[PDB]
């Protein structure tokens, strides 16, 4: 694809240059929010000292604003320079909207089918290595949907662009009870059904 | 020679006429900036025009305008109402927002030929103000379509365009001189095309 | 809060005095698309899908981080040299897929609520440091401006091998060890 | 605007050079370039907030730095003959990360690197009065100035009339002429024209002056030759109007 860009961080006003060690941390976050394709796009650039967000530009506002008393000198300075304001406003297109075109061709088309396995522990339905995050898991006892007795872990982010989730069922197995785990995911046209028979 | 291409090393144009200088570029950047720089014989790099990739409206700065064709990756510069002061080396420049390196093309040398209304080509002999023995030969008032040839052991300069602003009288001139005792202003410009109507006064 | 279908960090920009060190990375829906190796001047995409089809010039990162260094000095003075507050990290260890002895799997160590972004993550196999088959993410951003980081250990599950994720952070009084063991 | 010093400089092979640049007031970014006829414009490095942010492909003997007020210096150690070039400084506002696209150049430093200083010569300057035939034929009068035998071509020619520099009616060769085109160390020649009306030349009170500024060696430069040390100097020639 074409070379992608990030948000350009505005230059701060300055003209030049215990038991644990000291650390001074600076963070700048160029954040793009997308809703309903690119019909609703919002750019929020955040300027953070340590963990204190002290100034930000918000495309819904159109100018920089101070967040904490640490921010007025920066926000006033950045709002007075046309080379900072107009360039930041343009990033809604040059950064957010353009990069989204490459997300549409890669990240937003990534469909990894979930792996569904059943193992006793409480019956555990492991749904592993799927993407994107939207998933629906249901327990069934002989074509009867279980509503009580189901405990699911939160959605688990593996950090490698896959998710997993464990859905557990407190049950009493008899000789005729057949338990099935039903999983729905955008990578699947039809649900995955895995059976466990006592 | 790969990111920015100026295929025209030299270009000429008549004064007050329009000339277009070619420039194409090749890149994978999504956002970038295109420039034209003017470098006159003073060697000063002058920024003439700036174009943003995301603003498809062709940039214009008075007599200067560009034809920015983003899909064709073409960025030609149009110089309208060419002035004598436009004589310079012209550089096409590219700056990608990602690589952030200003890259220049090979350059295009532009010469503007003056408008000569009533040509009166002539060769004069000028004496040194201190020694009457030394002299130079001056070829002047010829039309802009006349070219001056150089040498041997005889020095001839290229033609020069001056402008007397009090009367707006532009004129071409070239200078020749030699130390040898068989020099002659009439013989001085034999190698260059002297028009048949050129005035060779008697000393 | 801002509700949206997709959230991207087209610029997680980090710089800190300790080191000093920095980080430039892009995120989409909470996952890391790439980081820029500032020393080697290279864009390192986190999926082979991304390197084949996407471009990002590392010079954009080097330029932005240099600005962060400038901004940090300016705000250090403006804050009267207010240092970062150490947070207590949270560590969790789990496998990538259901564990089956003899079948290659992956141990995942999530170090959450990291601040400042300075941490040691070490895998121990039967009490000894293991670096073979080890990889990790960069620092991943969080909405409260702390970080999390995930380390991975590829391993062959066996009844005679136990594991620990050793995490060292200034917010901890001593190295934190989260233990993990197979089915039996 | 962007200012540079020195404008002209002569060095010998092996010496070092330090160039100075002051960017446009308020600009935070300074970029350095080298312009040669064989390689064109070549990027050296870019400085911001006293640190190098962007680098070209020049060897380590090319270095630079930037101070707290954003002024910049660059240095070339162990000078080679191929280092002879125009060294350009360009400044950008750079008020945000990435905004160095628009760069405004300074005048540049003309650096000539020689094997030795033995072929360095100031110019000889002469003024040639207009011919009587031109005055009769056109009622105009062209004065010619000739500067010869100078090396290198670090010269600036100007015309002065009654103690005031003039530009209207002046034409100077765009590039010096090589006196010995075969010799790669040839001394140069340069000519210029000043054309006035016949009435102006025919006033004996009018004083015409051709002035050539030559940039050569400094007063504190080593010189062990049998001729005068070719120092930076102004060589001038004159002419007076004639009524006759
Ligand atoms: C991450 O692990 C690092 C490597 O073990 C560690 O650095 C080490 O820190 C210790 C002290 O905390 C240094 O030991 C120093 O040891 C004693 C004090 O314990 C001093 O008297 C010595 O002079 C020496 O300086 C190690 O030298 C140091 N290792 C290095 C520098 O390679 C980090 O502290 C860990 N990071 C954390 C916990 O955030
Ligand atoms: C999304 O935007 C499209 C136009 O881009 C519009 O037609 C559609 O109604 C919108 N949907 C919602 C749910 O807002
Ligand atoms: C910084 O804070 C301390 C108190 O915490 C105060 O005494 C000191 O004066 C402050 N710095 C300056 C420059 O005033």
Short mmCIF file of C-alpha atoms in Angstrom, two decimals, chain D residues 1 3 50 67 103 125-126 170 180 222 225:
data_model
loop_
_atom_site.label_atom_id
_atom_site.label_comp_id
_atom_site.label_asym_id
_atom_site.label_seq_id
_atom_site.Cartn_x
_atom_site.Cartn_y
_atom_site.Cartn_z
CA UNK D 1 16.14 35.11 6.52
CA UNK D 3 22.27 33.74 6.88
CA UNK D 50 20.12 20.48 19.15
CA UNK D 67 22.94 25.05 19.48
CA UNK D 103 12.82 24.66 3.44
CA UNK D 125 40.82 45.26 -13.96
CA UNK D 126 40.57 47.65 -16.91
CA UNK D 170 24.67 46.83 -16.61
CA UNK D 180 43.44 28.39 -20.61
CA UNK D 222 50.75 31.41 5.25
CA UNK D 225 56.08 32.74 -2.75
#
